[PDB]
Swiss-Prot record:
Belongs to the RAP1 family. This is DNA-binding protein RAP1. It is found in: Nucleus; Chromosome, Telomere. The modification Phosphoserine is found at residue 58. The gene is RAP1. The chain holds residues 674 to 824 of 827 of the full protein. Essential regulatory protein in yeast whose DNA-binding sites are found at three types of chromosomal elements: promoters, silencers, and telomeres. RAP1 is also involved in the regulation of telomere structure, where its binding sites are found within the terminal poly[C(1-3)A] sequences. The opposite regulatory functions of RAP1 are not intrinsic to its binding sites but, instead, result from interactions with different factors at promoters and silencers. RAP1 mediates repression of the HM loci and telomeres by recruiting the SIR complex. It comes from the Eukaryota. Interacts (via C-terminus) with RIF1. Interacts (via C-terminus) with SIR3. Interacts (via C-terminus) with SIR4. Interacts with a GCR1 homodimer. Present with 4390 molecules/cell in log phase SD medium.
Length: 151
């Protein structure tokens, strides 16, 4: 694989261009603590800090709890996000940056973020929908997703 990726534009969004707190951030998704961050950048920096701690695939529970106590993200929200990312933590920050940039939950057209529609397409045999899926996520992620289904 190349050290570079055109997906980086989804990770390099300048948090300072995002009004805080984002309109999409409601109490059904975030805890009181979240609303005490002074800016989108402060929140993202803390999120990066949490995500960096050591977590073995057995510590998803602890990660979710930390995301609640440190960043103010509701637990089942974090769980749902981790699920649509196929467990790829590297895409966790991307999820929030894009959700906040366009105030849509979940971001509908972001590589690595599997929407309900993407999953329906993956479960089907309609090659036109699968064509768009691989363009969006890539074959590697599709295989990992197919894997995820098996359970």
């Amino acid at each position: 694989r190349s050290d570079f990726s055109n997906e980086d534009i989804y990770d390099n969004i300048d948090p300072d261009t995002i009004s805080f707190p984002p309109k999409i951030a409601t109490t059904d998704l975030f805890l009181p603590l979240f609303f005490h961050f002074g800016s989108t950048r402060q929140f993202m920096d803390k999120l990066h800090e949490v995500i960096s701690g050591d977590y073995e695939p057995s510590q998803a529970e602890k990660l979710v709890q930390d995301l609640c106590d440190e960043t103010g993200i509701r637990k089942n929200f974090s769980t749902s996000i981790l699920t649509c990312l196929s467990g790829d933590l590297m895409v966790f920050p991307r999820y929030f940056l894009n959700m906040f940039k366009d105030n849509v939950n979940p971001p509908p057209n972001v590589p690595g973020i599997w929407t309900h529609d993407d999953d329906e397409s993956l479960k089907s045999n309609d090659q036109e929908q699968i064509r768009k899926l691989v363009k969006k996520h890539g074959t590697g992620r599709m295989e990992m997703r197919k894997r995820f289904f098996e359970k």
